[PDB]
Every structure is written in C-alpha cells, then in structure tokens.
Amino acid sequence: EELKGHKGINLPPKFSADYDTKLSAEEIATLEKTALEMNKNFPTSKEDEKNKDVMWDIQHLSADQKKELSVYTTELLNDVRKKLGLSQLSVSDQSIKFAWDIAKYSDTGEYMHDVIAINKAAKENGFKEYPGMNYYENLGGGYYETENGKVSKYTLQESIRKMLVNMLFDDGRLGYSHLHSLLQDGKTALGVSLSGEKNSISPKIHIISYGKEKLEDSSQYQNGEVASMKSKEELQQEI
C-alpha cells in the first residue's frame, strides 16, 4: 500500500531550519534521538522489492534515470521545505547537467568536496565561482558500494533517504552545515549525481542546489518542474 511505502521524512516536534541555535542542549539531544528513531526504517512497498533487481550503472545512467534520481530526492526535500514554509525546488535539465558535471570532475579518490571540480562545473554551466569554497554541494560518502559500477535503484533510494535523515537530524559533528544548506531559503533548483570508480567502497552522492542568484547575469535559467509528492498528512487527512 501507498502509506506503508510512503518515504516522507517524519519531522520531530520543535524542528526548524535552525534548531541547533533555537533549542537548548537537552532539547537538541531529544529532537535528534526522536527523529533518528522515527526515521530508521526505509519505508518499502512491493514496487520497492522489484527495484532491488533494477540495476543502475552509476557512470552510465540514461537521461530518464538521472531525472528520476533528482525528482525522487527533490520530492523528499520539498516535503520538509514546504512544511517549514521554505521555497520549493525544481528539477531541470540545467540542474541535472550541472550536478553531473560536478560528479564527472570530482576526484574519485577524494572524500571531501572537490572545490576545483565544483567551480569548474559552475563556470561551464554559467554559475558563479567561489575560489576554494563550496556553496553548491552536500556530499554523502560511503552510503553504498559499486559492483562493476552497478547498484540497485532500491539501494540508491534507500541511501539517499538515509543521507537526508542524517543531514537533517544528525549533523552536529559537522556544525549543522548540511542542515542549514538543505533548508536554505530562496533555493529554487536541485540536481543529484553520483560518482565513483567501478569497484569502490567509497562512491558518492552529490546533492547540488541553489537559487537564481548563483547564475551569472548573462546565464540562461531554466524554470524546470517543481517536484511535489502528496504529504503523509494530506493522505491521512483524505481517509
């Protein structure tokens, strides 16, 4: 059924884009423990069991598979952003191409942001550069493995949701940079890409997001489509 398989992130009480400064130490601990518990199980439908035998080549994805990956991720994040009254994100050919350029240029041997790769991709896609800095990428490393460069669609969707849960509710050892970035107001676009050597215990998920103020003045912006799934609360309130 639709509800048992619904992959929406369950928000804890007192959640906000800046809970790390709004809440006390004791309330932060309680929020994070609650939220990680309430999101530990990847919600699975019979469609998801079949996705376990859909194998994706992370360095060979089709245009449709790239768009699916970005839409899946943007739906989950937009569900949280809409609850917090933040701007909703689009997926476009522009956001996908930018993300996959970052992935292609990123050093597969490197665990941290590849700022040279991000700025090179930015310049070629008409975005502003920030030499030595990264204001485009949230990176998840070590959430999955590539066998001959391949990984199931199920595994990628499972890893992406776990990555978002960890960035929204367990980001304190990284100073909440990912919490703040994923929930930054005024963002309008997201793309998701993947990188890694064929046989890697360290392939990556690149979440690329921005607003139109990151484009150079002359650069063409693509509105694309706002990714929106029905919320669990909307679905429950229908019944």
Ligand SMILES: [Mg+2]
């Ligand atoms: Mg990161």
